[PDB]
Coordinates of C-alpha atoms (C1' of nucleotides) in Angstrom, one line a residue:
Chain X
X306 CA -194.5 221.3 176.3
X307 CA -192.9 224.5 175.0
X308 CA -192.8 226.0 178.6
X309 CA -192.2 224.6 182.0
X310 CA -195.7 225.5 183.2
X311 CA -197.4 223.1 180.7
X312 CA -196.1 220.0 179.1
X313 CA -195.6 216.3 179.2
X314 CA -191.8 216.1 179.7
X315 CA -190.5 219.6 180.1
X316 CA -192.5 220.6 183.2
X317 CA -190.4 218.1 185.2
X318 CA -186.9 218.7 183.7
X319 CA -187.1 222.5 183.7
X320 CA -184.8 222.6 186.7
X321 CA -182.5 219.7 185.6
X322 CA -180.0 221.9 183.9
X323 CA -176.9 223.3 185.6
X324 CA -177.2 227.0 186.2
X325 CA -174.5 228.0 183.8
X326 CA -176.2 226.5 180.7
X327 CA -178.7 229.0 179.2
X328 CA -178.7 228.1 175.5
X329 CA -178.6 224.4 174.7
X330 CA -179.3 222.1 171.8
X331 CA -179.4 218.3 172.3
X332 CA -180.2 215.3 170.2
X333 CA -181.6 212.1 171.6
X334 CA -184.2 209.4 171.6
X335 CA -187.7 209.5 173.3
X336 CA -189.1 206.3 174.8
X337 CA -191.6 205.0 177.3
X338 CA -190.7 204.2 180.9
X339 CA -192.6 201.9 183.3
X340 CA -192.0 203.0 186.9
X341 CA -193.6 200.1 188.8
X342 CA -190.9 197.9 187.3
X343 CA -188.4 200.8 186.7
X344 CA -187.8 199.4 183.1
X345 CA -188.1 200.8 179.6
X346 CA -191.1 199.5 177.6
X347 CA -189.7 198.3 174.3
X348 CA -191.3 199.9 171.3
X349 CA -194.2 198.0 169.8
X350 CA -197.2 196.4 171.5
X351 CA -199.5 198.3 173.9
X352 CA -198.1 201.8 173.4
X353 CA -196.9 204.4 170.9
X354 CA -194.7 207.1 172.3
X355 CA -196.0 209.6 169.7
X356 CA -199.6 209.7 171.0
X357 CA -199.5 208.3 174.5
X358 CA -202.7 208.4 176.4
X359 CA -202.7 210.6 179.5
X360 CA -204.4 208.0 181.8
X361 CA -201.6 205.5 181.3
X362 CA -199.1 205.1 184.1
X363 CA -196.2 204.9 181.6
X364 CA -194.2 208.1 181.2
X365 CA -191.8 209.7 178.7
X366 CA -188.0 209.4 179.0
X367 CA -185.4 211.3 177.0
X368 CA -182.0 209.5 176.5
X369 CA -179.4 212.0 175.2
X370 CA -176.5 211.1 173.0
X371 CA -175.1 214.4 171.6
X372 CA -174.9 218.1 172.2
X373 CA -174.6 220.7 169.4
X374 CA -174.5 224.1 171.1
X375 CA -173.9 225.3 174.7
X376 CA -173.7 229.0 175.6
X377 CA -173.4 230.2 172.0
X378 CA -170.6 227.7 171.4
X379 CA -170.8 225.7 168.1
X380 CA -169.8 222.2 168.9
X381 CA -170.8 220.7 165.5
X382 CA -167.2 220.7 164.2
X383 CA -165.6 219.2 167.3
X384 CA -164.8 215.5 167.9
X385 CA -167.2 213.1 169.4
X386 CA -165.1 212.8 172.6
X387 CA -165.2 216.5 173.3
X388 CA -169.0 216.6 172.7
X389 CA -169.4 213.7 175.1
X390 CA -167.3 215.5 177.8
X391 CA -169.2 218.8 177.4
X392 CA -172.5 216.8 177.5
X393 CA -171.4 215.3 180.9
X394 CA -171.4 218.9 182.3
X395 CA -174.9 220.0 181.0
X396 CA -177.5 218.4 183.2
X397 CA -177.4 216.2 186.4
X398 CA -179.5 213.2 185.3
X399 CA -182.8 212.6 187.1
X400 CA -183.7 209.0 186.2
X401 CA -187.1 208.4 184.6
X402 CA -187.2 211.8 182.9
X403 CA -183.8 212.6 181.3
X404 CA -180.7 210.4 181.0
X405 CA -177.4 210.0 179.3
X406 CA -176.7 206.9 177.2
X407 CA -173.7 205.0 178.5
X408 CA -170.9 204.4 176.1
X409 CA -168.1 201.8 176.8
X410 CA -164.6 202.1 175.5
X411 CA -163.7 199.0 173.4
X412 CA -160.8 198.2 171.1
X413 CA -161.3 194.5 170.2
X414 CA -163.8 192.4 168.3
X415 CA -164.4 190.0 171.2
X416 CA -165.9 193.0 173.1
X417 CA -168.3 193.8 170.2
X418 CA -169.5 190.2 170.1
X419 CA -169.8 190.1 173.9
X420 CA -171.9 193.3 173.8
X421 CA -174.2 192.0 171.0
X422 CA -174.7 188.7 172.9
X423 CA -175.6 190.6 176.1
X424 CA -177.9 192.9 174.2
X425 CA -179.7 189.9 172.7
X426 CA -179.9 188.5 176.2
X427 CA -181.5 191.7 177.5
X428 CA -183.9 191.5 174.5
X429 CA -182.7 194.6 172.7
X430 CA -182.4 195.2 169.0
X431 CA -178.6 195.3 168.8
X432 CA -175.6 197.5 169.5
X433 CA -174.1 200.5 167.8
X434 CA -170.5 201.7 167.5
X435 CA -169.2 205.3 167.4
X436 CA -165.8 206.5 166.1
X437 CA -164.2 208.8 168.8
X438 CA -163.0 211.3 166.2
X439 CA -166.2 211.5 164.1
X440 CA -167.6 214.9 163.3
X441 CA -171.4 215.7 163.1
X442 CA -172.4 215.7 159.5
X443 CA -176.1 216.5 159.3
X444 CA -178.2 214.3 156.9
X445 CA -175.3 212.0 156.1
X446 CA -175.4 208.2 156.8
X447 CA -172.5 205.9 157.8
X448 CA -169.8 208.5 158.4
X449 CA -168.8 207.8 162.0
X450 CA -171.8 205.9 163.4
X451 CA -172.4 202.1 162.7
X452 CA -175.1 199.7 163.8
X453 CA -175.0 196.0 164.3
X454 CA -177.9 193.5 164.8
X455 CA -178.2 189.7 164.9
Chain W
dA1 C1' -109.3 180.1 82.9
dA2 C1' -113.9 178.4 84.2
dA3 C1' -117.4 176.6 87.7
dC4 C1' -119.2 176.2 92.3
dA5 C1' -119.8 177.6 97.2
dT6 C1' -120.1 181.4 100.8
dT7 C1' -121.3 185.9 102.3
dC8 C1' -123.6 190.4 102.7
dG9 C1' -127.1 194.1 102.0
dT10 C1' -131.7 193.8 100.7
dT11 C1' -136.6 192.3 100.9
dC12 C1' -140.8 190.2 102.7
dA13 C1' -143.5 188.2 106.2
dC14 C1' -144.8 187.5 111.0
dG15 C1' -144.9 188.6 116.0
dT16 C1' -145.1 191.9 120.3
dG17 C1' -145.8 196.4 122.9
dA18 C1' -148.1 201.0 123.3
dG19 C1' -151.9 204.5 122.2
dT20 C1' -156.9 205.6 121.1
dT21 C1' -162.1 204.8 120.9
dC22 C1' -166.3 202.3 122.2
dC23 C1' -168.9 199.4 125.4
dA24 C1' -170.1 196.0 129.7
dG25 C1' -170.1 195.9 134.4
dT26 C1' -170.2 197.8 139.4
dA27 C1' -170.8 200.8 143.8
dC28 C1' -173.8 203.9 145.6
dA29 C1' -177.5 208.1 145.8
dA30 C1' -182.1 208.8 145.5
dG31 C1' -187.0 207.6 144.2
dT32 C1' -190.3 204.5 144.9
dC33 C1' -192.7 200.9 147.2
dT34 C1' -194.5 198.5 151.3
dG35 C1' -195.6 196.4 156.4
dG36 C1' -196.9 197.2 161.5
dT37 C1' -198.2 200.1 165.3
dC38 C1' -200.9 203.4 168.1

DNA sequence: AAACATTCGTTCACGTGAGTTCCAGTACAAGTCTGGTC
């Protein structure tokens, strides 16, 4: 949906943005949410989030992890911490339709292994790590973002 | 007074360090390939 009147995810989150924010760019991941369990349907069997069938009870959820512009302010060159803080003041999350990915501060390896073990326990792919001072470099790989899997 | 031994500047050979050119190997970007799913 390109307008609040008609869409599959936008008609519900039109009014989820604080009044001050008028121009806003966000980056995130789109996934499928099962409400009867209140759990995210892991990608794979029984559904594709690209061409979901209307009759299905599953719905679309947007998990945000970055902001690149708010009220004609260019946040590309700022540090990750600042972008996170500004992101916290964009929308009031409304579970099931738009959310912010939680990030935990960690400064030891035991924490990383604990997180990976817990992720495997919750049947997730893995865990990723972000450098607090990393800048957004479009199209580049392995600059401030790292991923870890079993 | 004559013969023999020692010494010194000279010569050759051999060994070691530094500069130059050519080539083997390595890390990573990008192209290409492929599987599964709806």
